[PDB]
Design a protein around this ligand. Structure first.
Ligand SMILES: NCc1ccc(C(F)(F)F)cc1
Length: 330
């Protein structure tokens, strides 16, 4: 079996991507943020605290004839950005573009943090990292990809995120028309539960490729590219007027600048992120100072190849016996 769904940026800045998901019987469509950096499928629901719901579409388990309360199960997650959500669990039918899973754990939110309330376009998350990170207690649950993997034509899923444009999430197959050249595969470590790999280095614009091992995760749920401070300082040093602002919380640059591109290595292959992808607009409404898309990972603990980097490539998340990551230019 296969699944194919269109993913859309939530705003003009590509702050996040949403993808329609059908839950329950009859189908209740929720626009979820597919997240390769987490492993909980959670949604805004009829149980969410009234004041914490602001325009999102909710899941009403009592209206699904196939929804079953998972006895004594609760979930609670805190993301790298300081955001969080928690609640109870149901098992229900979940479909993504024609691919269906019955008995999928659907984590119903009782509470969500301010940033989730503020994003009215995000109805919840669909975790695509390894099921070892799932927060359901006392009995851990599997991801949608984990539940479907055996039935797929090929145990893979691809992320083809668009820059200011619609894109695609495919399950079970590789669309050979969705990329140029070849897919270069690289080794993955599942020790921290993430699609963790090692980049072979970087270049800034037309500069010399610096060969250096950058360990990081492929994370569709994180907007920006987070890299070591030495790497990030070398990039912003090429932009006139760019500086690291402690008030803003990262590198800012004059909005009139034309940013150089950023290249990251995948084995001997190279993925080029065009400079325009690194522009995240004014720091505040009306400001002539813009926020950067490449930031330091020094206070994070790990490097994150977020949407800024992933949207420059066709990305294969290979769930074979030994998982690997594939990257191709597009
Ligand atoms: N990395 C997961 C994630 C995704 C979205 C959000 C936000 F912005 F919706 F709150 C927070 C955390």
């Amino acid at each position: 079996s296969t699944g194919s769904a269109t993913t859309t940026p939530i705003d003009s800045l590509d702050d996040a991507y949403i993808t329609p998901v059908q839950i329950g019987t009859p189908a209740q469509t929720l626009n979820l943020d597919f997240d390769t950096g987490s492993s909980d499928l959670w949604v805004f629901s009829s149980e969410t605290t009234a004041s914490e719901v602001d325009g999102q579409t909710i899941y009403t388990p009592s209206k699904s004839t196939t929804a079953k309360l998972l006895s004594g199960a609760t979930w609670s997650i805190s993301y790298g950005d300081g955001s969080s959500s928690s609640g109870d669990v149901y098992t229900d039918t979940v479909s993504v573009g024609g691919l269906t899973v019955t008995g999928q754990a659907v984590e119903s939110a009782k509470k969500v943090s301010s940033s989730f309330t503020e994003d009215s376009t995000i109805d919840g998350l669909l975790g695509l990292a390894f099921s070892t990170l799932n927060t359901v207690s006392p009995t851990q649950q599997k991801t949608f990809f984990d539940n479907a993997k055996a039935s797929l034509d090929s145990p893979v899923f691809t992320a083809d995120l668009g820059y200011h444009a619609p894109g695609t999430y495919n399950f079970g197959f590789i669309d050979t028309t969705a990329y140029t050249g070849s897919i270069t595969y690289t080794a993955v470590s599942t020790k921290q539960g993430f699609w963790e790999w090692t980049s072979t280095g970087y270049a800034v614009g037309s500069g010399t490729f610096k060969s250096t091992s950058i360990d990081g995760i492929a994370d569709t749920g994180t907007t920006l590219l987070y890299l070591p401070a030495t790497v990030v300082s070398a990039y912003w040093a090429q932009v006139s007027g760019a500086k690291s602002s402690s008030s803003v919380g990262g590198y800012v640059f004059p909005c009139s600048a034309t940013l150089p591109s950023f290249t990251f290595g995948v084995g001997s292959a190279r993925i080029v992120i065009p400079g325009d992808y690194i522009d995240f607009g004014p720091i505040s409404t009306g400001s002539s100072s813009c926020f950067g898309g490449i930031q330091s990972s020094a206070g994070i603990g790990i490097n994150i190849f977020g949407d800024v980097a992933l949207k420059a490539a066709f990305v294969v998340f290979n769930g074979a016996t030994t998982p690997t990551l594939g990257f191709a230019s597009k």
